[PDB]
Amino acid sequence: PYRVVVLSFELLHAPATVCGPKKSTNLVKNKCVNFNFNGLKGTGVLTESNKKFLPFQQFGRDIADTTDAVRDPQTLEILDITPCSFGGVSVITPGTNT
């Protein structure tokens, strides 16, 4: 006698029922890093901000629709985002002949 279990799952993806992903990861701070906190993706630096969020708020925004702050799902702490340093470069020369 062999005990056998049969498994059948449907398709068409519209009644999102069970699933998964999971696959959590540790946290970093004060360094440029790509983040996927809950589905939003971006690049910047992480720090602490005194601004507070309402209990139902997920992630903040600002004028000109930029992702300002995100709340970490694991700990529910307000974190801030600031991109890596970027800017133009200029060269000063006194003349190649001189």
């Binding site: 999102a16 507070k52 309402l54 139902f56 992630f59 903040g60 925004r61 004028i63 702050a69």
Partner: protein
């Protein structure tokens, strides 16, 4: 089981004017000190809503206080009472048990949301005997539990936590909508009042669930008061008392929202309402110069 209601009653569906009520956070994002503009389903300002109220107390005629009401895209269900009678939002279907059916019966042992494919019953009314503990003995809304899809149990919902005074100890303001299938229920609780109040408020979101079904119209429910004092048939033998609750309707519209510095909504102005409007919205500022 379930019993068909009798002694049908017809009263005029009185009307009253809404005064800048029913504004809810459209998106789950945080802003501050910005006058954002949106466009979604809302309740138009100064809309004419269909008033309902519970009359014919004791066992005079007792009224049919819970008729069948249509559902297009949303409701602004409200409630003002003291004894916590309004419950049971049985809606979301064609009421023919054709597809998955929804109901919200709470303030039981715990707040629960039973959602099943049960075969319907013609007249719904929840038994609440005049005993020490009001036991919901008779689920007269259905007489079967043929199939079920989802079950929900939540501790906090419709909590009537207020002081002990004879005024109207609640002011419920719900918003029922189906975003392409997903049911999002926005709600809030308001302190007592001493007749819609001309005030401005925001509606915090609550738990949502996909389900996904065809929706035809709406039906409400009230707590019964059957007792041995009044001899009545199983169709109708309960004392009504006195209660009031309004019903509105939602539709697409364009709104302008002003956020506080903590992020709570503090003021809103409706577009396409008055000639003064469509100028306040256009300049994107609440103050307009000559």
């Amino acid at each position: 089981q379930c019993v068909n209601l009798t002694t049908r009653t017809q009263l005029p569906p009185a009307y009253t004017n809404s005064f800048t009520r029913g504004v809810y956070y459209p998106d789950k994002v945080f802003r501050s000190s910005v006058l954002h503009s949106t466009q979604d389903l809302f309740l138009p300002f100064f809309s004419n809503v269909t008033w309902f109220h519970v009359i014919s107390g004791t066992n005079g005629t007792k009224r049919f206080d819970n008729p069948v009401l249509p559902f297009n895209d949303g409701v602004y269900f409200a409630s003002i009472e003291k004894s916590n009678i309004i419950r049971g939002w049985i809606f979301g279907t064609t009421l023919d048990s054709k597809t998955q059916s929804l109901l919200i019966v709470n303030n039981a042992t715990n707040v629960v949301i039973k959602v099943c494919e049960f075969q319907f019953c013609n007249d719904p009314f929840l038994d609440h005997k005049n005993n020490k503990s009001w036991m919901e003995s008779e689920f007269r809304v259905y007489s079967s539990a043929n199939n079920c899809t989802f079950e929900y149990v939540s501790q906090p919902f419709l909590m009537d936590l207020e002081g002990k005074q004879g005024n109207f100890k609640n002011l419920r303001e719900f918003v029922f909508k189906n975003i392409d299938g997903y049911f999002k229920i926005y709600s809030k609780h308001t302190p007592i009042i001493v007749d819609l109040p001309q005030g401005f408020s925001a509606l915090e979101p609550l738990v949502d669930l996909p389900i996904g079904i065809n929706i035809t119209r709406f039906q409400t429910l009230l707590a019964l008061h059957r007792s041995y004092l009044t001899p009545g048939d199983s169709s109708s033998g309960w004392t009504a008392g006195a209660a009031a609750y309004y019903v509105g309707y939602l539709q697409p519209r364009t709104f302008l929202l002003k956020y506080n510095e903590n992020g709570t909504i503090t003021d809103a102005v409706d577009c396409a309402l008055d000639p003064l409007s469509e100028t306040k919205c256009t300049l994107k500022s609440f103050t307009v110069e000559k």
